[PDB]
């Protein structure tokens, strides 16, 4: 792979990108609009520590921790937002 870099506002996710991230963290957006703020927050979360976005030779995007060599498909914080969605759903019930 190779690290993804921009080189030498546009970074705001689209409503459609937020919808898709919401589904990925377990929200049913049509039924649970009250949870969508977690999707808006989580989609722009920074990569922790020394994690960097990378793309392999087949074009697939993944995350690589250059400090320790760990790799994963999802953003490392996505599991935290999955957990918060479950807690927020229970809190509001």
């Amino acid at each position, epitope marked *: 792979g190779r690290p993804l870099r921009i*080189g*030498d506002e546009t970074y705001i996710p*689209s409503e459609q990108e937020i919808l898709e991230f919401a589904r990925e963290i377990g929200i049913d957006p049509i039924k649970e609009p009250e949870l969508m703020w977690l999707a808006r927050e989580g989609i722009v979360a*920074p990569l922790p520590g020394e994690w960097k976005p990378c793309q392999d030779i*087949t074009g697939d995007i993944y995350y690589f921790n250059f400090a320790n060599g760990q790799s994963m498909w999802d953003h490392p914080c996505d599991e935290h937002y999955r957990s918060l969605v479950i807690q927020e759903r229970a809190k509001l019930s």
Partner: nanobody
Amino acid sequence: QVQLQESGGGLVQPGGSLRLSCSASGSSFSINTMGWYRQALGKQRELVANINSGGSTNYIDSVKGRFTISRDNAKNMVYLQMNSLKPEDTAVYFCNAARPLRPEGGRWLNYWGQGTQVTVSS
């Protein structure tokens, strides 16, 4: 929503030239890393060339110096100029958009066109 539509493929004589185009929708075009990938029948998808927002390019070794990737940011277009085409260039060619959510240390989303066939044949 970033959406890609490739065109310009088809049959081409060995040794010939061909330019592929891709139209991209969405507002994030100028910050995206745009690329061309190809998938030979029965094989994996493989980088052909890409170009990041700042214009840095990477090429797969087998096409370096025969192919050129370019972008027109005002028109939201990506292009692949191909020269000295060979039978092993036969594949479905896909345009790719890798979209950053942060200038550094962020999530990137990956978008694909449907592909256009290139067949290098006498």
